Amino acid sequence: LPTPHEIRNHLDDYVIGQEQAKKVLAVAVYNHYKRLRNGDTSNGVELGKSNILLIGPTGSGKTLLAETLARLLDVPFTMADATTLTEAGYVGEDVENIIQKLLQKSDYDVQKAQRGIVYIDQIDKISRKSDNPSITRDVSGEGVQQALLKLIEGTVAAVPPQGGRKQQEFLQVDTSKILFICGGAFAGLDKVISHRVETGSGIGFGATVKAKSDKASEGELLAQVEPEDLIKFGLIPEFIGRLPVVATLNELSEEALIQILKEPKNALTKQYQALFNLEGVDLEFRDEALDAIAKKAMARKTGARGLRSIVEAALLDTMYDLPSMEDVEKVVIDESVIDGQSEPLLIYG
Amino acid sequence: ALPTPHEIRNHLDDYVIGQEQAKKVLAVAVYNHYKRLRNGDTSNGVELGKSNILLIGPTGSGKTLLAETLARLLDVPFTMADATTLTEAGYVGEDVENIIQKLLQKSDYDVQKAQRGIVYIDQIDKISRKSDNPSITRDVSGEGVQQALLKLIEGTVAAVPPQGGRKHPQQEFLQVDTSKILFICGGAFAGLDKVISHRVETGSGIGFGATVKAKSDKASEGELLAQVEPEDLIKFGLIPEFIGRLPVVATLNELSEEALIQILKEPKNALTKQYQALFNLEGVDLEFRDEALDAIAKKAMARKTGARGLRSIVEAALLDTMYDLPSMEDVEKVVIDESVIDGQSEPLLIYG
Ligand SMILES: Nc1ncnc2c1ncn2[C@@H]1O[C@H](COP(=O)(O)OP(=O)(O)OP(O)(O)=S)[C@@H](O)[C@H]1O
Ligand SMILES: Nc1ncnc2c1ncn2[C@@H]1O[C@H](COP(=O)(O)OP(=O)(O)OP(O)(O)=S)[C@@H](O)[C@H]1O
């Protein structure tokens, strides 16, 4: 009997600064369990299913949320990608590949698989290139979206169980109850949102001028997104209609990174702490060193994923002579070490 | 007795609202189909024709909804196939014959009982060549799939494996006549309004003599479909042969502002009744006043996504409420005012 507060508390341990995103998942997860729990033999018939669309900046933690969810989730979960999908039975891949991947996690249990959750990454890769209907067939893009429409609403797709032993049959897999979380970092969406959010004005004398968009306000700008803007970006309205809900993720700032290095249990700081714990050596991270990493992380425009480059670059010299070194019990990383002027202080004990 | 067009439509009215034109067309075909089968066919009139239906309507107008509601009341077997996965010449994707075997699963492998079944093919527009494309490579999911359905719709015998085959020992197929099978092929066509305008607008008019069309008040999209003809679809990509097999057409009359309000209250499967049951098990009931729904209708039409895009308006409001509702105790009723939809205020909570 999980609750949004309990599930959010668990997710909060691994994610920070995504209060709006977390609420959406908690409701769907809570409602999905509630929907399946219901016998369906009641006044409410064919209860609706709310899908989710996770849009956010690069490296903001979208892919991480789906991974952490599967650990806590009891029902099966699968994480596919739309990069390999090709329409019309081409050589690349078919959409049915997503369903068979779910059974691998579910051990080929049809009744248990229909109640599963699905996640897709890099959904923007199939958006039309800001054009009108094409003059030719776009195998990857407009074509792929057309195929997913019926899958999201609910239908049965042929799937060989285990790939087939040697049977010549396929197992029907309902999808009316399956939830879908399609999310990927869209590029350039702010420029499109800027045009629509801005009222617009005529350049002549009589036409009034409107002073707006003084600051980019990226995080606050994506919140004003609507389906009509995505149509101009390349998505088909049919595909978005299948995804009523949407999630806007703020971009992490200098202060957000500091909390990510200490509060989460799987933080990189704690990883190295365990790396040296087995070696009989302790590790420490002072606040002055984390402040400098934040400024360097933003300088590389890579997000949280670009943080390891800064850490490994500093501890490189240390890690080269640490195993051979003996009688060392503690390592401290100061602010100077990041700049490279100094070396990390080692204590012998 | 037999089901009547008026009686069958009343059943559909419970699940569909504002589609009087479409309901009648479907009722007649279903009644005609039952009539043709009921008839022995060994009479003066023979080789009776089958009138197929072609449903053209915008997204979320209720095309897919009609097929599901029909199968519930319909006694004969029904299937919901799609032309998106079909590939011609037996390629690796899928074959057109797959539609037939799916029908038998509902019919329990009864050939005589299967020919009288009904089929609904969605996403039919997605297999049309748009225009002026490279001819070095032939279309596999475009111009080449419609050709395969021509013989199927007109009536031919297609080999089908029985149950997929227990082992190689059988190595046999089943022959199923399809001349009697009905086909309802419909999908939301994109960009059809632009081609129809060229024929019925003739108003670029930059010269003195030519007129000006008074642009921004003539884009009557829904009404524009009402004047559709087969020649317009040829420019869209459909082959005349495929259209000849589908004489009937049914404009959908997509949506009226007031229709959306009726869909949320009168239907049994309305969204309002869904959430009402969602909280009913939790010992909580929520009411939606009419003053709140009028604002919701205006927000949905602004999104240009149809009824399917309506949940976005509801869940965006009730997000914070549903997140902190279980933790709350002694709460028996919730009221949602117009302000809640706007976001200025919060939904009032009642304590028992
Ligand atoms: N809030 C966060 N707290 C802790 N680690 C985070 C956070 N956000 C991102 N990360 C780190 O970023 C890694 C990858 O996050 P992702 O979910 O891939 O971000 P992303 O924006 O989804 O990148 P994409 O989807 O591949 S473009 C995780 O394994 C974490 O190490
Ligand atoms: N007349 C209607 N009355 C009630 N609900 C409707 C009506 N029309 C559409 N809906 C809602 O819209 C949902 C989907 O409608 P569809 O039948 O899928 O429309 P559609 O034309 O098939 O869209 P496509 O072709 O699948 S993109 C239904 O499940 C209903 O919730």
PDB file of C-alpha atoms in Angstrom, chain B residues 43-202:
ATOM      1  CA  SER B  43     -33.213 -15.380 -54.525  1.00  0.00           C
ATOM      2  CA  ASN B  44     -33.889 -13.335 -57.656  1.00  0.00           C
ATOM      3  CA  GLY B  45     -31.373 -10.751 -56.456  1.00  0.00           C
ATOM      4  CA  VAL B  46     -27.899 -12.247 -56.099  1.00  0.00           C
ATOM      5  CA  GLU B  47     -24.259 -11.238 -55.609  1.00  0.00           C
ATOM      6  CA  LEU B  48     -25.334  -8.375 -53.369  1.00  0.00           C
ATOM      7  CA  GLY B  49     -22.770  -5.626 -52.996  1.00  0.00           C
ATOM      8  CA  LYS B  50     -21.071  -4.702 -49.738  1.00  0.00           C
ATOM      9  CA  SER B  51     -20.837  -1.014 -48.864  1.00  0.00           C
ATOM     10  CA  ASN B  52     -17.626  -0.211 -47.031  1.00  0.00           C
ATOM     11  CA  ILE B  53     -17.185   2.889 -44.871  1.00  0.00           C
ATOM     12  CA  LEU B  54     -14.364   5.442 -44.893  1.00  0.00           C
ATOM     13  CA  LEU B  55     -14.182   7.642 -41.776  1.00  0.00           C
ATOM     14  CA  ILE B  56     -12.391  10.984 -42.174  1.00  0.00           C
ATOM     15  CA  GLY B  57     -12.123  12.995 -38.986  1.00  0.00           C
ATOM     16  CA  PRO B  58      -9.630  15.037 -36.960  1.00  0.00           C
ATOM     17  CA  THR B  59      -7.712  13.689 -34.018  1.00  0.00           C
ATOM     18  CA  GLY B  60      -9.723  12.783 -30.943  1.00  0.00           C
ATOM     19  CA  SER B  61     -13.044  13.175 -32.737  1.00  0.00           C
ATOM     20  CA  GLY B  62     -14.200   9.683 -31.725  1.00  0.00           C
ATOM     21  CA  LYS B  63     -13.313   7.370 -34.622  1.00  0.00           C
ATOM     22  CA  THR B  64     -11.605   4.721 -32.492  1.00  0.00           C
ATOM     23  CA  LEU B  65     -14.369   5.006 -29.900  1.00  0.00           C
ATOM     24  CA  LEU B  66     -17.082   3.902 -32.325  1.00  0.00           C
ATOM     25  CA  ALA B  67     -15.281   0.675 -33.232  1.00  0.00           C
ATOM     26  CA  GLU B  68     -14.956  -0.417 -29.599  1.00  0.00           C
ATOM     27  CA  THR B  69     -18.550   0.403 -28.652  1.00  0.00           C
ATOM     28  CA  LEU B  70     -19.780  -1.404 -31.749  1.00  0.00           C
ATOM     29  CA  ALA B  71     -17.987  -4.641 -30.854  1.00  0.00           C
ATOM     30  CA  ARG B  72     -19.698  -4.760 -27.460  1.00  0.00           C
ATOM     31  CA  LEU B  73     -23.230  -4.688 -28.874  1.00  0.00           C
ATOM     32  CA  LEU B  74     -22.286  -6.534 -32.065  1.00  0.00           C
ATOM     33  CA  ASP B  75     -22.783 -10.298 -31.982  1.00  0.00           C
ATOM     34  CA  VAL B  76     -20.655 -11.223 -35.013  1.00  0.00           C
ATOM     35  CA  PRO B  77     -16.855 -11.147 -34.487  1.00  0.00           C
ATOM     36  CA  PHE B  78     -14.904  -7.897 -34.597  1.00  0.00           C
ATOM     37  CA  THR B  79     -11.201  -7.062 -34.779  1.00  0.00           C
ATOM     38  CA  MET B  80      -9.120  -3.886 -34.471  1.00  0.00           C
ATOM     39  CA  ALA B  81      -6.228  -4.134 -36.929  1.00  0.00           C
ATOM     40  CA  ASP B  82      -3.865  -1.475 -38.273  1.00  0.00           C
ATOM     41  CA  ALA B  83      -2.181  -0.816 -41.610  1.00  0.00           C
ATOM     42  CA  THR B  84       0.937   0.713 -40.048  1.00  0.00           C
ATOM     43  CA  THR B  85       2.738  -2.618 -39.584  1.00  0.00           C
ATOM     44  CA  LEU B  86       1.769  -4.029 -42.995  1.00  0.00           C
ATOM     45  CA  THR B  87       4.462  -4.572 -45.630  1.00  0.00           C
ATOM     46  CA  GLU B  88       3.936  -5.814 -49.174  1.00  0.00           C
ATOM     47  CA  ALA B  89       5.370  -8.899 -50.877  1.00  0.00           C
ATOM     48  CA  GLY B  90       5.792 -10.822 -47.637  1.00  0.00           C
ATOM     49  CA  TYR B  91       8.580  -8.693 -46.185  1.00  0.00           C
ATOM     50  CA  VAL B  92       9.909  -9.063 -42.640  1.00  0.00           C
ATOM     51  CA  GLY B  93       7.521  -6.482 -41.211  1.00  0.00           C
ATOM     52  CA  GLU B  94       4.110  -8.118 -41.608  1.00  0.00           C
ATOM     53  CA  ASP B  95       1.724  -9.415 -44.258  1.00  0.00           C
ATOM     54  CA  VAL B  96      -1.830  -8.409 -45.083  1.00  0.00           C
ATOM     55  CA  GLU B  97      -3.057 -11.933 -44.342  1.00  0.00           C
ATOM     56  CA  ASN B  98      -2.255 -11.419 -40.638  1.00  0.00           C
ATOM     57  CA  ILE B  99      -5.521  -9.476 -40.351  1.00  0.00           C
ATOM     58  CA  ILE B 100      -7.470 -12.610 -41.262  1.00  0.00           C
ATOM     59  CA  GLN B 101      -5.918 -14.893 -38.643  1.00  0.00           C
ATOM     60  CA  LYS B 102      -6.576 -12.279 -35.957  1.00  0.00           C
ATOM     61  CA  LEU B 103     -10.261 -12.439 -36.858  1.00  0.00           C
ATOM     62  CA  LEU B 104     -10.358 -16.198 -36.285  1.00  0.00           C
ATOM     63  CA  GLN B 105      -8.978 -15.820 -32.749  1.00  0.00           C
ATOM     64  CA  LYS B 106     -12.188 -13.993 -31.858  1.00  0.00           C
ATOM     65  CA  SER B 107     -14.217 -16.522 -33.870  1.00  0.00           C
ATOM     66  CA  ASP B 108     -12.481 -19.640 -32.447  1.00  0.00           C
ATOM     67  CA  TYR B 109     -11.365 -20.810 -35.912  1.00  0.00           C
ATOM     68  CA  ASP B 110     -14.802 -21.038 -37.551  1.00  0.00           C
ATOM     69  CA  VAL B 111     -14.377 -20.320 -41.255  1.00  0.00           C
ATOM     70  CA  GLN B 112     -18.081 -20.192 -42.108  1.00  0.00           C
ATOM     71  CA  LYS B 113     -18.638 -17.909 -39.112  1.00  0.00           C
ATOM     72  CA  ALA B 114     -15.510 -15.818 -39.787  1.00  0.00           C
ATOM     73  CA  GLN B 115     -16.378 -14.538 -43.270  1.00  0.00           C
ATOM     74  CA  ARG B 116     -19.305 -12.624 -41.743  1.00  0.00           C
ATOM     75  CA  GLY B 117     -16.987 -10.713 -39.390  1.00  0.00           C
ATOM     76  CA  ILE B 118     -16.229  -6.996 -39.275  1.00  0.00           C
ATOM     77  CA  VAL B 119     -12.809  -5.333 -39.475  1.00  0.00           C
ATOM     78  CA  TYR B 120     -11.586  -1.840 -38.567  1.00  0.00           C
ATOM     79  CA  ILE B 121      -8.297  -0.602 -40.042  1.00  0.00           C
ATOM     80  CA  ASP B 122      -6.909   2.470 -38.288  1.00  0.00           C
ATOM     81  CA  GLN B 123      -4.047   4.715 -39.430  1.00  0.00           C
ATOM     82  CA  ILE B 124      -5.094   4.203 -43.047  1.00  0.00           C
ATOM     83  CA  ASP B 125      -3.782   7.578 -44.213  1.00  0.00           C
ATOM     84  CA  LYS B 126      -0.221   6.728 -43.123  1.00  0.00           C
ATOM     85  CA  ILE B 127       0.311   4.435 -46.170  1.00  0.00           C
ATOM     86  CA  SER B 128      -0.112   7.082 -48.881  1.00  0.00           C
ATOM     87  CA  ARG B 129       2.670   8.496 -51.036  1.00  0.00           C
ATOM     88  CA  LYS B 130       2.593  12.245 -50.549  1.00  0.00           C
ATOM     89  CA  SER B 131       3.858  13.469 -53.934  1.00  0.00           C
ATOM     90  CA  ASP B 132       6.824  13.734 -56.332  1.00  0.00           C
ATOM     91  CA  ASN B 133       9.107  11.294 -54.527  1.00  0.00           C
ATOM     92  CA  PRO B 134      12.197   9.451 -55.820  1.00  0.00           C
ATOM     93  CA  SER B 135      11.193   6.451 -57.914  1.00  0.00           C
ATOM     94  CA  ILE B 136      14.573   4.681 -57.711  1.00  0.00           C
ATOM     95  CA  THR B 137      13.246   2.763 -54.682  1.00  0.00           C
ATOM     96  CA  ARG B 138       9.652   1.571 -54.676  1.00  0.00           C
ATOM     97  CA  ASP B 139       7.432   2.350 -51.712  1.00  0.00           C
ATOM     98  CA  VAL B 140       6.893  -0.632 -49.418  1.00  0.00           C
ATOM     99  CA  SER B 141       4.548   0.886 -46.821  1.00  0.00           C
ATOM    100  CA  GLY B 142       3.027   3.460 -49.189  1.00  0.00           C
ATOM    101  CA  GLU B 143       1.735   2.917 -52.717  1.00  0.00           C
ATOM    102  CA  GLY B 144       2.578  -0.784 -52.415  1.00  0.00           C
ATOM    103  CA  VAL B 145       0.257  -1.650 -49.531  1.00  0.00           C
ATOM    104  CA  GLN B 146      -2.945  -0.252 -51.020  1.00  0.00           C
ATOM    105  CA  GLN B 147      -2.479  -2.517 -54.038  1.00  0.00           C
ATOM    106  CA  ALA B 148      -2.455  -5.563 -51.764  1.00  0.00           C
ATOM    107  CA  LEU B 149      -5.723  -4.599 -50.075  1.00  0.00           C
ATOM    108  CA  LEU B 150      -7.547  -4.176 -53.400  1.00  0.00           C
ATOM    109  CA  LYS B 151      -7.999  -7.899 -53.974  1.00  0.00           C
ATOM    110  CA  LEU B 152      -8.653  -8.542 -50.292  1.00  0.00           C
ATOM    111  CA  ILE B 153     -11.474  -6.001 -50.089  1.00  0.00           C
ATOM    112  CA  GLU B 154     -13.037  -6.993 -53.417  1.00  0.00           C
ATOM    113  CA  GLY B 155     -13.068 -10.645 -52.332  1.00  0.00           C
ATOM    114  CA  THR B 156     -10.439 -13.316 -52.835  1.00  0.00           C
ATOM    115  CA  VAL B 157      -9.177 -16.451 -51.100  1.00  0.00           C
ATOM    116  CA  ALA B 158      -6.118 -15.965 -48.883  1.00  0.00           C
ATOM    117  CA  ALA B 159      -4.104 -18.815 -47.394  1.00  0.00           C
ATOM    118  CA  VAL B 160      -4.014 -18.768 -43.578  1.00  0.00           C
ATOM    119  CA  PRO B 161      -2.159 -21.232 -41.283  1.00  0.00           C
ATOM    120  CA  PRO B 162      -4.440 -23.034 -38.771  1.00  0.00           C
ATOM    121  CA  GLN B 163      -3.450 -21.846 -35.279  1.00  0.00           C
ATOM    122  CA  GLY B 164       0.060 -21.080 -36.574  1.00  0.00           C
ATOM    123  CA  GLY B 165       0.884 -24.772 -37.041  1.00  0.00           C
ATOM    124  CA  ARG B 166       1.618 -27.325 -34.330  1.00  0.00           C
ATOM    125  CA  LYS B 167       4.671 -28.579 -36.247  1.00  0.00           C
ATOM    126  CA  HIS B 168       6.001 -28.796 -39.801  1.00  0.00           C
ATOM    127  CA  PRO B 169       4.002 -32.033 -40.244  1.00  0.00           C
ATOM    128  CA  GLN B 170       0.761 -30.215 -41.116  1.00  0.00           C
ATOM    129  CA  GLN B 171       2.256 -27.735 -43.652  1.00  0.00           C
ATOM    130  CA  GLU B 172      -1.224 -26.671 -44.772  1.00  0.00           C
ATOM    131  CA  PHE B 173      -3.242 -23.460 -45.001  1.00  0.00           C
ATOM    132  CA  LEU B 174      -6.895 -22.442 -44.813  1.00  0.00           C
ATOM    133  CA  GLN B 175      -8.764 -20.721 -47.651  1.00  0.00           C
ATOM    134  CA  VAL B 176     -11.192 -17.988 -46.548  1.00  0.00           C
ATOM    135  CA  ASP B 177     -13.429 -16.080 -48.947  1.00  0.00           C
ATOM    136  CA  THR B 178     -13.527 -12.342 -48.216  1.00  0.00           C
ATOM    137  CA  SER B 179     -16.083 -10.976 -50.723  1.00  0.00           C
ATOM    138  CA  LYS B 180     -18.632 -10.817 -47.888  1.00  0.00           C
ATOM    139  CA  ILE B 181     -16.286  -9.314 -45.292  1.00  0.00           C
ATOM    140  CA  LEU B 182     -16.932  -5.687 -44.392  1.00  0.00           C
ATOM    141  CA  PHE B 183     -14.081  -3.207 -44.015  1.00  0.00           C
ATOM    142  CA  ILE B 184     -14.125   0.103 -42.148  1.00  0.00           C
ATOM    143  CA  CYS B 185     -10.909   1.943 -43.025  1.00  0.00           C
ATOM    144  CA  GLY B 186     -10.547   5.325 -41.370  1.00  0.00           C
ATOM    145  CA  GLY B 187      -7.837   7.618 -40.093  1.00  0.00           C
ATOM    146  CA  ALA B 188      -7.304  11.294 -39.402  1.00  0.00           C
ATOM    147  CA  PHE B 189      -5.858  12.757 -42.588  1.00  0.00           C
ATOM    148  CA  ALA B 190      -3.305  15.542 -42.172  1.00  0.00           C
ATOM    149  CA  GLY B 191      -3.133  18.481 -44.548  1.00  0.00           C
ATOM    150  CA  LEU B 192      -6.282  17.493 -46.434  1.00  0.00           C
ATOM    151  CA  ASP B 193      -7.794  20.935 -45.838  1.00  0.00           C
ATOM    152  CA  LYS B 194      -5.073  22.636 -47.888  1.00  0.00           C
ATOM    153  CA  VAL B 195      -5.694  20.543 -51.007  1.00  0.00           C
ATOM    154  CA  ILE B 196      -9.462  20.947 -50.733  1.00  0.00           C
ATOM    155  CA  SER B 197      -9.073  24.721 -50.503  1.00  0.00           C
ATOM    156  CA  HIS B 198      -7.225  24.980 -53.835  1.00  0.00           C
ATOM    157  CA  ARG B 199     -10.227  23.551 -55.666  1.00  0.00           C
ATOM    158  CA  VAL B 200     -12.898  25.501 -53.718  1.00  0.00           C
ATOM    159  CA  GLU B 201     -11.003  28.768 -53.028  1.00  0.00           C
ATOM    160  CA  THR B 202      -9.541  30.046 -56.350  1.00  0.00           C
TER     161      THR B 202
END
